[PDB]
Amino acid sequence: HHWGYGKHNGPEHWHKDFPIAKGERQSPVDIDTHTAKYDPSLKPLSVSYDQATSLRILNNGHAFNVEFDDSQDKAVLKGGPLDGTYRLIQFHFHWGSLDGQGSEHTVDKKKYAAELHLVHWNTKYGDFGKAVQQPDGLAVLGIFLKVGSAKPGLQKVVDVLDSIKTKGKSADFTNFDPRGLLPESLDYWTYPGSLTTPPLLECVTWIVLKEPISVSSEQVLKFRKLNFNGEGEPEELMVDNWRPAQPLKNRQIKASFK
Template sequence: TVLRSGPLPGLYRLRQLHFHWGSSNDHGSEHIVDGVKYAGELHLVHWYSKYSNYAEALRNYDGVAILGIFLQVGKSPKPEMKRILEEINGIKTKGKEAPFSNFDPSILFPKSWDYWTYHGSFTTPPCEECVTWILLREPIIVSPDQV
């Protein structure tokens, strides 16, 4: 899966996706927009394909692009989240991974592709400053059980 265009100078390849969530339905997102925090935030981490690998991309200013999607709690579950949540249930400790293939992450995206963008760093240590952030303005709606 790739990401290109918009604020990006070339083709970025998907490395991994992960979620951030908190202890309540309004305190899980990494970003705050106009004072509003969301229940969670999905990050799709991509690296610039002009570099030979992800490690090299991390050492360069334009090396990484992260597509961030806010999670907002609603009444109905998002059916497209089912497979991911099944895999996540197998992760019980920090640092574990659940690799899987034949998955198109675009099924998780909201209808609108309007976004904010800025250059910054990862939100977790060592906080490399090589990230072009692309935050979709429209959140996806998930049920309380999916957060």
């Protein structure tokens, strides 16, 4: 009836309705650290999230998204491998049923427990819908999450999950500061890719951070208690909402550090 991550509508079937799945610049991919080219001409990232306005949080049956007011240049990403300004529209996570899987990108075949995606769109295109029709319309900042110590800034997110347990539920989520989810260093790898969920459009410049953030076992436990199903339908726990690594093909992954 629609795509998902189950046996019958999972990643291995998406190509049937989304032919782009077998394309040339699909994500995610495995980051081979020994083959990434150090590119000294890449500039440092400029993450300016101080006037950021979160509006709400919702469960959409695939994951949960925290949405921001993107009608103005209030929270932006610039510099790095980018030309122009990209406005923050929302962020979400991909996670697993077990601590040893959950991330979409891998490092030297290594899978982390989850992965954060901060989605931005190229302001030169006017709105989000126009950006997805261009090769450089989107910029997604990806951060790996590892099980260890509790992350203070993640707790607000964790406290509200209970109010959006099933598909379609939302709740107001104001005054959330996204800066509390970043690691100390902004060293990164970059490559041309795509959305990791249908429609799988190849409009993305991926920026994967080297240093992961650590979150407590209890914090990740609460993610696994959400539901794929809407209210009143049989329960299907929301876990393993990740796409396996795709072939690199004719692409090169660059690194901003030696």
